[PDB]
Structures are given as structure tokens and as C-alpha cells.
Design a protein around this ligand. Structure first.
Ligand SMILES: *P(=O)(O)OCC(C)(C)[C@@H](O)C(=O)NCCC(=O)NCCSC(=O)CCCCCCCCCCC
Ligand SMILES: *P(=O)(O)OCC(C)(C)[C@@H](O)C(=O)NCCC(=O)NCCSC(=O)CCCCCCCCCCC
Ligand SMILES: O=C(O)CN(CCN(CC(=O)O)CC(=O)O)CC(=O)O
Ligand SMILES: O=C(O)CN(CCN(CC(=O)O)CC(=O)O)CC(=O)O
Ligand SMILES: *Cc1c(COP(=O)(O)O)cnc(C)c1O
Ligand SMILES: *Cc1c(COP(=O)(O)O)cnc(C)c1O
Lengths: 84, 75, 124, 395, 395, 124, 84, 75
């Protein structure tokens, strides 16, 4: 059986690392902040089937992040004034 | 200024005063960090020093001195 | 649906019987203008049991499947048992939507047509 | 499982990759409201809006001020037909259209008939083409508008648009054409054709779904009563937020079509001749619906006697097609098709991305399964036995 | 050059990346017409349509059969207000709305006033909230519909929707709410709130532009006269081709919003309190338009006395904002704002992707440039010299 | 447009002159309700030449730029030459759209107001 | 000065090679066929400014092809029946 | 069957009967090919033999024997 803890921590790192590659400032800051807040908010879940539901949802969102980061790089634009 | 910028990073990440960030201190057992904080700590050191810390190395960086040692041995 | 398409991709009992036989009853129902014509023929032995049946249908897949299923179902039944075959049974077996229930109704009409053409020949 | 071939472009088209590429910046970074006048997200969004307006106008020979963005050709048809009839209702109450129009044009007319308007639904000949002289005789002193589609969505016949324009122009009647199935496929010029209003759909020309346009002539000024009330966007003729990504796609599709229409027509014509000739040379009792002398080659409507159309579509399980479709058949009834033969009609669509391999596959499978369905057909069996079907008491 | 911060979400929102990801398969490979009944391109397109319908319905507590797709909240507002008034015109001729509604609701009502309907435009209090007891007194025996928006697009005030529902329900009057600025941001339940009709806009909730929905209650059945005639799509209530990619995006946006609304509200409230408090603690004569006790925090409308708003927007050259915007100011006039102070109002928008760094930047620049513009202002100079402005003979 | 925004980002002649001077003419035009108030003051030497000018404007950027440009333009002209400054000149220099031409009109109104307040003091 | 012939032939190869990477059959076959037909149709152009206009247009379409091939790979689907 | 599948590819590409595709023949001067045909020819050989022919090698493949030699020397 797969380890839920090993999965969650590996998903946590991969999700943060990928979100940091967003070109757009508003998507990048949101994703990094949302992942950090969501993993922390669900830290004390005990129901093993609730955790697997969350894990699968994270794996799906990691695919969303990976695809949207790439298309955001293909169609990029200048940074905002506050990134100077 | 020196490579002891590692200490400053551990401080901001775990919300600990720089006086309590000692060399022999461990993140989990001495600075109240969990497994989510440590993931962010490793990444923070990765961004600070422009280095790539793989999983087999990040698992060994559990104390402050271990973090200073890995960074000093990787330019 | 797979149940309806199967009756075209894997046809069965498609063909014709001898209309001139006293033991063959032919039912032809529908109209070309209405997009649905059903020809159903049955063969009865001398004991009253349908021993064979054939069909040909001009119509949509649900009509093809309705008359194809009816042609299967009459085989092995007697003339009296085949009268009890209802359009609701055909629709249930094929999981027909309400917009295709008329196909089951015409399939029932085809059975009773052929059954009546047979019984008309058995008068003397 | 493997996916079927797409041969249904009259229902909708795939996005041209050039169109998607043009839209994507406005789906990622340039998401501003084109009506936001105070910042750069608005300025760049508005500039893309107006750039698209010029692209649409160049394709049909219009002035960009005459292009109004809509949600599709359905809404454009409503704006043209209902907007014109309502604006002049105090002096004109009669409208003219054809029996083979798209259902949105017909139901808009039935809607106006219940509002107190008189509508003449012109018949077509067996060819599917209106009689120009019947149109002239139908025009009354209180005729407000004439509406005739450029290319029919079901059988692909081309109506004589330029000749209808001369009739309407010389009588001071407004002329609207539903060009949804024609824009970017055949030449269109509003001035040469004397068009006063035109409906355009984006997803019939490899642009995105959910966008269209209406051309409204400004000289001489054509007046239209607006139907969608709101903030006055699009010169008060179509209120609501102009969807910048969608109109950018429409403009890109119009510019691509302006560049590709000649090449597409040569390729599609050759593919269309091949599909029709190889089917008819291998199957008896196949009839094409609509006159090939006045026909867009990408819309082929054939009848296969003694075979019901839906069963043929089912039999062609790996080809995406349609039968009696609105992008029974009132169009087929209108060209005088027999009712039984109307149940036997299939529409093949060939487009910018169709290959010779797809046509040959479709032709082979169609030949194969018409023969199979005929062997299952009692009407074919009766005809094979020398029985006249028009002598049987059915029902 | 570097791009300005986006603080204008009430005008439109960026696409949530989850929404774009959900739409893109329907822009590349699944391009079928959802109304094509005979092939897999249609089947898969229709399944995505109905999946989106359920997502919209789950967010507002409706049955999917009660969700109709439209091109935006503008069209939904037209369908609700014009469709209801026209259906019951033979028995009911009176409609009720507010003076602060979106311009599409107001112009639809002015359109109906010219068609022979009687419209009561209810006033609001200084808070921007209607008086529930004035609404009850306004209801006449022939009142057909009451329409009150859930959240105001200009000042963000929340009307008492559930209490309005109880008034309308208990008098057998239909209740429509324009919820464009509320869907996915505050809790909505059609049953608990006794809503009969609701307008929804996709691009106000991080979905694509050019799509929306109207909820129409089915029990007890609410009847609506259709305005867009056509093939009868969407149960005959909104004809035209349902744009599958756009409605897929709307459903995805509704599902994301249902999951994120609580988290967003906590984050946006904290950011909104920070923007208001840090501006007002550093600038005198700053007034917030609208009662903070009944207010969506993401729409902040402030006036800066003695400074004209457009110049302030120009001075904030690196922040995208608006002033007196419709997503002078009739909304500000309606809450009894002084005319001079109405020219001094700015709308700040904070959304799902706004950062604390952006708020702090906006606050600093706003403080900086209100001081500069006041030093250029003759009205500020006169007040500094102890002159009462309400005693000068202007014009 | 860059020409209009320049008058805010790089302000010039913003301020006030002594209203009690016999050589200072003050023009105050517009209304706070109309969103546009323009205060323009000029200083004339004893030879009739405007030697200085100041302005303060409550209004949009086009109004700020219109009165700012007028304050520049009156400097170095005589009282008679400044009367010939037309709103069309201000609008052309600033490339004003038609929806902002009222700003140039009020800017012209401000010059003539201050010029009239000066000439009224020169009566004795 | 850049060589127009060297540019055109290098663009011809890169455009065909990239179009062959389209996952979707209808885009792949169209692009390969269109590029082959367009370069052949414009073979006998002599106006050097007309050639540069065509070259620039090709370079722009090569960017379109590159981006659309990638997003077609991120959002791919099964092949059609005739690719078996 | 043999590595002389090169000949068949040149034939289909340039529309030349296999009898005229001789070893010493050049595509341009002997088989009526232009610079657009040769680009397609190289790519066709690339797809047939699952090989990658870079620009500096494709410029040398101008005759039939040169094409047979390059393919034979690259598995
Ligand atoms: P560590 O202190 O040794 O342990 C940490 C963990 C979480 C492993 C430990 O506390 C634990 O085992 N908890 C049990 C409950 C649990 O596993 N919770 C986490 C489940 S995973 C989750 O919450 C997914 C959240 C997904 C957020 C995605 C946001 C993406 C948005 C996209 C934007 C474009
Ligand atoms: P070779 O026989 O030595 O020489 C070949 C060339 C063409 C170099 C030679 O004949 C020549 O020099 N001709 C002069 C004219 C010329 O250069 N013509 C070619 C110009 S480039 C061109 O035509 C671009 C065509 C772009 C088609 C893109 C289609 C993409 C579609 C996208 C779909 C998603
Ligand atoms: O918050 C984050 O982790 C994302 N960004 C925040 C934005 N950066 C600027 C930039 O990355 O260009 C910080 C900033 O806003 O100055 C930093 C990164 O990881 O790259
Ligand atoms: O025409 C082409 O060059 C594109 N395709 C045509 C499609 N192929 C099938 C496939 O590539 O899966 C040939 C076919 O249709 O059998 C081949 C390729 O280059 O990959
Ligand atoms: C597609 C079609 C319409 C409807 O256009 P939409 O963009 O789907 O609203 C109208 N007329 C014709 C001929 C059509 O084919
Ligand atoms: C945006 C808006 C509308 C219009 O919605 P669209 O989708 O742009 O047509 C209607 N009402 C309110 C309150 C709005 O903010």
C-alpha cells in the first residue's frame, strides 16, 4: 500500500516548486499561498478515505499547475510595476 | 553577510529569534517545525543560495549545522 | 446504446419466408412516409408452435432492433403465447428512450399482424 | 477507443490553430474589459476588439463602423429581422423570407407574425433556389425587409444574393442575408451584392463558439431597433460586455478565411466531386438534393432510396455526419422531395482540414452499409420483385 | 514597459487557471456541437454541457433543469425582466426595481415603460440599501416582478435578498435578483432566499467572458417569454448554439468558487479592512460610499474630497481602477452623495489573486497623490483658508 | 496621451499670487458640481506685459493640462495678446478628444476671467 | 544582408518538421500539406520585398505551429479510426 | 527489402520510375528535382530509416548513391 505521508510531502514539494515557475505574478503568488494554506488546513485530518480524496485532488491540481505554467510561458508578458 | 545567512533563513521560516537559532538545534525538536515547515525551509535555502537540494540530501538537513555544512560544501 | 446497435452489427433472422404457405403468417406494418416499415414473418408447425421467423425493416436503429428482437422472441412460443408479447417488454429489453417508444409499438403491431395473417389461413 | 472522422462541418467547425493562438493571450494575460476606459488592461483589450472589427469588415468589404459583435448568427438574425420590423412598424408591416431558412430566421418570423406582422414565406424551386420574379411580385408597398440566406445549411445551395440586392435596392426595401454558412467560403461584398444586413457566425468558420457579428449598412443608413438593453455597448445596438477573446478569434478566423478561401475552395471542390462521383457510380438510386449548378461544394446532401437515414448514420459508426439536420426536414419538403426519400437523406460535410483519405473511407463505408441496409429493407425487397411502392395501402 | 496592478475585478476578472485548463480540451479536440445528436463529437460535447449545468446548479442550490445558459448577465437580465413582463402582460403590467441597479436592468425597464408597462424605481437609503417596508407598500395587485441585485457593482452593498424573497413569495410576485457580483463570493441558496430568477455572469467569477446563466424556478413554475427565437435550444428559453467551451468554463468557475468562497472571503475581508483603514488613517476627508454593515469587502468605493476622480486615476498611473463606473454616477446620486463628492469617488477592487503587496502599493500611491492633487486644487486651497464652499456663486 | 499627463507628472506654475495686488488678475471659473473648477492668476508689469502666472485646478487630467498650458502661454504676452488665445489652440496642442473640448473652453474662460479682473483694477 | 534562399529552405524544413509533431490528425495533415503547397505556389516570386513579406509571414506561422503543437500535446486525445 | 529501399523512396518523392533511378543519378540534374523536393526527400529518408540527418550531412546527399551510402553507414 502506498504511504500517505510520503505521498503528501512529495506532492507538497512538487506543487510548490511547480507553482513558483508561473510567469504571471498573480497566479504565482496565489498558487504558492493557496498550497501552503490548504496543506496546513488539512493537516489534522484522520479519516484515511478523506486523506486519499485530498491526495487525489492535489495530484489533479498538480497537473493543472504544470499545464498552466507551460501555457503561461508560451504566452507571457511583461512583469508588473511591483516586481521591479 | 557570511554563509551564516543560513541562520537568518531558518529564523524567518520558523518564526524564531536569531538568538535561539543555535548550531546544534534541530528544526523539529528544538524550533517547533513540522514536516510542512521543513519542506519550505529546504526550498528557502534552495532559493537563497541558487542550489538544488535533492530528496536524499534534504532528508539529512534536519539541524542548523547540517544546513550550514551542506551549503558550504556546494559553492 | 449497445443493446440497440447490436441488432444491426450482428444481424439475426434477417430474410423472408414463403408467403404462399398455409403455415407462414406475414405482417407488414408502417409506411415509408412515416420512416418506419416493418415486415415480420413467422413459421408455425402443425402443433401451433412458431418454429422459425424472419424480418426486414426500413427504419431507424431502434425500429431495426425492435423488430429484430420481436423476431427472436416469437421463436419457440405458440401462437397464443406470442399474442402476450407487449411493446413495453421490447422497450425495457432495449432500454428505449421515450422518443423511440413508437418503435416498440410498431414491433408489437408487426407480431399481431403476422399472427392474424396466419390465423386467417387456418380457418378451413 | 479510436475516434470517428469528423464530416459534419456545417454543424460546427474545429478551431483553426491560428485562431486559438490569437485568442490565448487574451485568455491568460490580457483579460481586461474592453469598456474599461481608465487603464491599460482596458486599452489593450479595446485595441484588440477594434482590430478584430476591421478584420471582419475587410472580409466582406464593409466599413468597421458597420460591424456589430454578437453571440452568434442566431442573435444577429434576431437583431436584423426583429430590429428592422420593429423600427419601421409604424409605416411598414410586411416581411419576406424563404421556406428553407434556418430555424432561427423562421421562428423569429413566426414570432413577428404573432406581434401583428404579415410574413410571406417564399417557396423555392426543386433546385432549392428562389424564383427572382416571384420575389419581385411579393414585394408590397409596406414591405419592410427581405431576408434570404446566402448558403443553405442543409443542402448547400447558393441563393442569388447580388440579384436579390438589385431588386431590394431598386424598391427601397432592406435586404438581409444569413451568411453563416458562406462567410470565408465564397466571395462576399456588401456593396457589389447590395446587402443591407448580414449575419455571421464564428464557429462555422473555424473560430470559437459563442461569437458572431451583424453587418448593418450605414450609407444609406439602415435603422434597427435594439433588442438587448444595457450600457449602450456596440453603438447602442448590442449591449453587454464585448467578449474580447471571442471577438479576437472571430477576427482572426475572418482574416485566415480571407487568405485561405481560394485555396480551400479548390481543394474542397475536388474532394466534393470525388465523394459524389464515387458514391453514385457504385450505388443505384442515389439522388443529390439541390442544384449542383448553384451549390457550395462543402455541403453535400444525398438521399439513398429504401434506406432510413438514422440507420445509415448508425451503420456509419466511425463517421460523424447528420441527417435532416438544422446545422422531418422542412428543407427537403420545400424542394419537393418525396416524404419517404426525405427520411433517406444524409448530409456530408467537407472542410478546410478534411483529407482525401477521409473521403475515401467515408465513401467505402457508405457504399458498404447502404447495400447492407437495403438487404434488410422490405421496400428494397418489394422493388426487387417488381412491385410499385406507390400502389400499396400503408398506415 | 512594466504593467499596472489589476485592482478592477468588479469590471471583469482574470481567468482562474483551473477554469482555462478545463476549457482547453473543448477548444482543441472536443469541438463538437452539443446539439449534434448522431455522433460522438456531439455526445461528448453535450455531456460536458450538462456537467457544467449541474456545477452551476450546485453552487446556488438549484436543480440543473432550472439553469439556462446565456451569453452573460446582461442577456439573463433581459430574459428575466422582459420575459416575465411580456408573459403576464395580459393580467399584470407593473414592475418594481431599484434606482441603483445595473444599467442593463434599468434600460430594460425603460424599454418596458415605452411598451406600456408601469415601472417603480425604488429609492435606496443613504446606506445604499432599500427600505423593505417601502417595497411592500409599492407592490400593487398587478405587480408582475420585483428585481433587486444581490451585490452592487459600484459600491458593493448587499441588499436583503432573503427578506425580499419572503415579501414577494407571500404576495405571489416573482422575485428576480441580478447576482452577477455575488455568485461564488457570498452564500446563495434559491430556496432559502426564495429566489424565482437569478442572473449569473461568468467573467465576474474568474470564468470566460461571453457566457452566463439565468436560474428560472420550476416549482412553483415561473413562466418566461423567450426573446431569442431559434431551434429551441435550452428548453426553448434561449435559442442558439450552446457554446460548449464557454459553458464548461462557467461550470468550472462555479465549482472552484463553491470550494474557494469561504477562504476567499476571509482573505479578501482582511485585505479590504487593511486598504480602508490605512487610507483613512492617513488622509482627511475620505468617505466610504455604502454601509459597511451590509457590504461585500471586495468592492470598496471611497470619495476623496477636493480631488476629481479621473485625475486621481490618472495620477495612479500604475494601478488599474475605475471611478463612477458601470462595472456622472447615478448610484452615488441615489445614496444622496453631494454632486461634487460624486466626482471625487474611486472604486477599488480586491479579488482572489490580489496580494497584500498590491494593497500596500495602492494605498501608498493613493495617499501620495491625493495630497499632490489637493495641493493643486483650488477648492482645497479655499477650505484651507476657512472658506465655506457652499457659499460661492459658481457656474 | 503623453502630452496631457505631462502637466501633472511635471507640474509648472502651480500656486497662487496676491489677490490684493492691483497688477494681479484672478479668474475663477467652473463649479464643483460640474467636476471642473479652474483658478488662473496673472501678474502684469507696469508696461502691460504678463510677467508671471499661477493656477490651481480641480478637474480631470485634460482640465489640469488645459489650464496648466494656458498659464504657460499667457506668460510673456501682453494683456491684449492674451485675449487672442483660443480654446482651439489649447485643444490642438494637447490633442484633445471631442469629449474633452469643454476643458479647453473653460481654460479660455479662465484667461479672460483673470484678464477682466486685472482690467477692472486699472480703471482709475 | 541575410540570404533569402538560405532562410526560405531552412524555414521550409523547420516548418514541415514541426508540423509533423501535431498530435491531431486533421491539424497535422493540413499543416504539412499547406506548407508544401504554399512554398511551391510562391516559388516564382521575384519582388524581393514580396519575398521578405512571405518570409516574415512564414516565421510568424512557425511560431504558431510550435505553440499549437505543444498545447495539442498537453491536451491530446485518441487517434482517429483511420490511423489504425 | 534490402537497403535499396532508398531507391523506392526517391522514386515516389520525385515521381520517377524505378528504372530511371540509377545509382549515379543526381536529384536535381537527372531527376528534375528542385530545392523544395530535396528538402522533402531528406525528410522522407529520415522517416523511413528512423534516422536524423543534420544540415551538414543533408547538403552532401545530392545523388542516389550518396543517399544509399549515408543510410548504410548509420545503421
Ligand atoms: P509532517 O509534520 O511529518 O506531516 C505532514 C502531514 C500533512 C503528512 C501530516 O500532518 C499528516 O499525515 N496529516 C494527515 C492528514 C493529511 O494528510 N492532510 C493533507 C492531505 S493533502 C491536501 O490537503 C491537498 C491540498 C491541495 C491544495 C491545492 C491548491 C491548488 C490550487 C491551484 C491553483 C491554480
Ligand atoms: P530551390 O529550387 O534551390 O529554391 C527554392 C526557393 C523557393 C528558395 C527558390 O525557388 C526561390 O528563391 N524563390 C524566390 C521566391 C520565394 O522565395 N518564394 C518562397 C517565399 S516563402 C513562403 O512562400 C511562405 C509560405 C508560408 C506557408 C505557411 C502555412 C502555415 C499554415 C499553418 C497552419 C496551422
Ligand atoms: O511568492 C512567491 O513565491 C512568488 N514570487 C513572488 C514575486 N516576486 C517577484 C518575482 O518573482 O519577479 C517578489 C516580488 O513581488 O517582488 C517569487 C518567486 O518565487 O519567484
Ligand atoms: O501526412 C503527414 O505527414 C502526417 N501524418 C499522417 C497520418 N498518419 C497516421 C499517424 O501519423 O498516426 C498516416 C495515416 O493516416 O495512416 C503522418 C506523420 O507524419 O506522422
Ligand atoms: C449556424 C447557423 C446559424 C446560427 O448561428 P450560431 O452562431 O450558432 O448562433 C444561423 N444560420 C445558419 C445558416 C447557420 O448554419
Ligand atoms: C457585469 C454585470 C452585469 C453584466 O454581465 P455581463 O456578463 O457582462 O453581460 C450585470 N449586472 C451586474 C451587477 C454586473 O456587474
Amino acid at each position: 500500500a502506498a504511504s500517505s505521508r510520503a505521498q503528501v510531502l512529495a506532492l507538497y514539494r512538487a506543487m510548490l516548486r511547480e507553482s513558483k515557475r508561473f510567469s504571471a505574478y498573480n497566479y504565482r503568488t496565489y498558487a504558492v499561498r493557496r498550497i501552503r494554506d490548504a496543506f496546513r488546513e488539512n493537516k489534522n485530518v484522520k479519516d484515511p478515505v478523506e486523506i486519499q480524496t485530498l491526495v487525489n485532488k492535489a495530484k489533479r491540481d498538480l497537473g493543472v499547475i504544470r499545464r498552466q505554467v507551460h501555457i503561461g510561458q508560451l504566452y507571457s508578458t511583461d512583469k508588473l510595476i511591483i516586481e521591479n | 553577510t557570511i554563509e551564516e545567512r543560513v541562520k537568518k533563513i531558518i529564523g524567518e521560516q520558523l518564526g524564531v529569534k536569531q538568538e535561539e537559532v543555535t548550531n546544534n538545534a534541530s528544526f523539529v525538536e528544538d524550533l517547533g517545525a513540522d514536516s510542512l515547515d521543513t519542506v519550505e525551509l529546504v526550498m528557502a535555502l534552495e532559493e537563497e543560495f541558487d542550489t538544488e537540494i535533492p530528496d536524499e540530501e534534504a532528508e539529512k538537513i534536519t539541524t542548523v549545522q547540517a544546513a550550514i555544512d551542506y551549503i558550504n560544501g556546494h559553492q | 446504446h449497445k443493446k440497440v446497435v447490436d441488432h444491426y452489427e450482428n444481424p439475426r433472422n434477417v430474410g423472408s419466408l414463403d408467403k404462399t404457405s398455409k403455415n407462414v403468417g406475414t405482417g407488414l406494418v408502417g409506411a415509408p412516409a412515416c420512416g418506419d416499415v416493418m415486415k415480420l414473418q413467422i413459421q408455425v408447425d402443425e402443433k401451433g408452435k412458431i418454429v422459425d421467423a424472419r424480418f426486414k425493416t426500413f427504419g431507424c436503429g431502434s425500429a431495426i432492433a425492435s423488430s429484430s428482437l420481436a423476431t427472436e422472441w416469437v421463436k419457440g412460443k405458440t401462437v397464443e403465447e406470442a399474442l402476450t408479447i407487449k411493446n413495453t417488454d421490447i422497450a425495457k429489453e432495449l432500454c428505449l428512450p421515450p422518443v423511440k417508444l413508437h418503435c416498440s409499438m410498431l414491433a408489437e403491431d408487426a407480431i399481431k399482424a403476422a399472427l392474424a395473417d396466419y390465423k386467417l389461413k387456418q380457418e378451413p | 477507443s479510436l475516434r470517428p472522422l469528423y464530416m459534419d462541418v456545417q454543424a460546427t467547425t474545429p478551431l483553426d490553430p491560428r485562431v486559438l493562438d490569437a485568442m490565448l493571450p487574451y485568455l491568460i494575460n490580457y483579460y481586461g474589459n474592453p469598456h474599461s476606459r481608465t487603464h491599460a488592461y482596458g486599452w489593450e483589450s479595446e485595441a484588440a476588439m477594434e482590430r478584430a472589427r476591421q478584420q471582419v469588415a475587410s472580409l466582406i468589404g464593409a466599413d468597421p463602423r458597420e460591424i456589430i459583435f454578437t453571440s452568434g448568427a442566431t442573435e444577429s438574425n434576431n437583431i436584423a429581422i426583429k430590429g428592422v420590423a420593429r423600427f419601421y412598424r409604424s409605416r411598414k408591416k410586411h416581411l419576406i423570407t424563404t421556406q428553407t431558412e434556418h430555424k432561427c430566421v423562421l421562428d423569429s418570423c413566426r414570432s413577428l407574425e404573432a406581434e401583428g406582422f404579415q410574413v410571406t414565406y417564399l417557396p423555392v424551386q426543386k433546385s432549392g433556389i428562389i424564383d427572382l420574379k416571384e420575389l419581385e411580385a411579393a414585394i408590397q408597398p409596406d414591405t419592410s425587409l427581405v431576408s434570404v440566406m446566402t448558403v443553405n445549411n442543409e443542402i448547400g445551395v447558393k441563393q442569388p444574393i447580388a440579384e436579390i440586392g438589385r431588386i431590394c435596392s431598386s424598391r427601397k426595401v432592406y435586404f438581409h442575408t444569413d451568411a453563416a454558412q458562406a462567410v470565408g467560403k465564397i466571395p462576399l461584398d456588401v456593396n457589389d451584392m447590395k446587402i443591407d444586413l448580414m449575419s455571421i457566425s464564428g464557429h462555422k468558420i473555424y473560430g470559437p463558439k459563442g461569437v458572431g457579428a451583424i453587418y448593418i449598412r450605414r450609407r444609406p443608413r439602415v435603422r434597427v431597433e435594439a433588442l438587448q438593453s444595457g450600457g449602450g455597448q456596440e453603438r447602442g445596438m448590442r449591449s453587454g460586455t464585448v467578449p474580447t477573446p471571442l471577438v479576437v478569434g472571430l477576427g482572426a478566423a475572418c482574416e485566415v478565411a480571407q487568405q485561405e478561401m481560394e485555396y480551400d475552395h479548390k481543394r474542397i471542390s475536388k474532394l466534393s466531386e470525388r465523394l459524389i462521383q464515387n458514391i453514385m457510380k457504385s450505388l443505384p438510386d442515389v439522388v443529390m438534393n439541390g442544384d449542383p449548378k448553384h451549390h457550395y461544394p462543402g455541403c453535400i446532401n444525398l438521399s439513398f432510396a429504401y434506406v432510413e437515414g438514422e440507420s445509415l448514420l448508425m451503420a456509419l459508426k466511425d463517421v460523424a455526419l447528420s441527417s435532416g439536420s438544422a446545422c422531418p426536414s422542412y428543407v427537403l419538403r420545400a424542394i419537393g422531395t418525396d416524404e419517404d426519400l426525405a427520411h433517406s437523406s444524409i448530409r456530408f460535410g467537407i472542410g478546410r482540414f478534411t483529407t482525401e483519405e477521409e473521403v475515401d473511407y467515408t465513401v467505402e463505408k457508405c457504399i458498404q452499409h447502404v447495400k447492407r441496409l437495403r438487404e434488410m429493407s422490405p421496400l428494397w425487397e418489394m422493388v426487387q420483385d417488381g412491385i410499385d411502392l406507390k400502389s400499396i395501402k400503408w398506415t
